[PDB]
Amino acid sequence: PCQAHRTLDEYWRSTEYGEGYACDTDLRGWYRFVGQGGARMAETCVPVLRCNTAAPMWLNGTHPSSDEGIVSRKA
Amino acid sequence: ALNIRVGGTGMFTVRMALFQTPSYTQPYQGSSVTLSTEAFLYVGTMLDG
Numbered sequence: 573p574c575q576a577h578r579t580l581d582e583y584w585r586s587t588e589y590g591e592g593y594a595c596d597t598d599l600r601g602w603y604r605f606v607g608q609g610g611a612r613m614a615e616t617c618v619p620v621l622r623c624n625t626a627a628p629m630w631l632n633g634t635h636p637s638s639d640e641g642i643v644s645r646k647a
Numbered sequence: 648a649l650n651i652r653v654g655g656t657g658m659f660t661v662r663m664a665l666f667q668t669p670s671y672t673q674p675y676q677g678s679s680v681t682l683s684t685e686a687f688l689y690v691g692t693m694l695d696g
């Protein structure tokens with residue numbers, strides 16, 4: 573878990589980024605969000621055509637607190 | 648000494664690919680792109696010859 577992960581340092585994945593078309597067909601596994609974009613990903617539905625992608629996603633709900641374990645969510 | 652002179656011609660391999668990202672990282676594997684005119688392009692050319 574917290575020891576086995578691949579960091580992702582992509583400054584373009586920010587909610588601020590204007591528009592692109594990259595699509596994550598190949599992202600497999602646990603990943604660590606690091607860089608200027610931040611440490612956590614989206615929490616509300618960001619408006620369309622952001623994050624270098626025509627149709628971005630987002631986690632609905634909230635981040636689980638510390639010491640909560642494995643949590644199931646539907647992005 | 649008998650000299651048999653032969654010749655030929657070859658073709659080098661040169662390509663391009665649309666990088667799906669800024670910083671020119673990942674190629675595009677789809678056969679067509681439908682984009683917004685305000686978005687930006689990111690393409691480069693390789694040399695495998």
Ligand SMILES: *[C@@H]1O[C@H](CO)[C@@H](O[C@@H]2O[C@H](CO)[C@@H](O)[C@H](O)[C@H]2NC(C)=O)[C@H](O)[C@H]1NC(C)=O
Pocket residue numbers: 599600601602
């Ligand atoms: C995220 O967690 C799930 C749950 O442990 C991992 O395994 C998936 O589990 C579901 C539910 O049993 C299966 O239907 C999937 O086939 C499992 N996925 C795989 C790839 O084996 C899942 O691997 C984890 N996903 C990532 C991207 O790390």
Ligand SMILES: *[C@@H]1O[C@H](CO)[C@@H](O)[C@H](O)[C@H]1NC(C)=O
Pocket residue numbers: 632633646
């Ligand atoms: C995701 O959470 C949002 C915010 O609470 C909610 O409107 C939506 O129904 C949730 N989606 C699912 C599939 O439960």
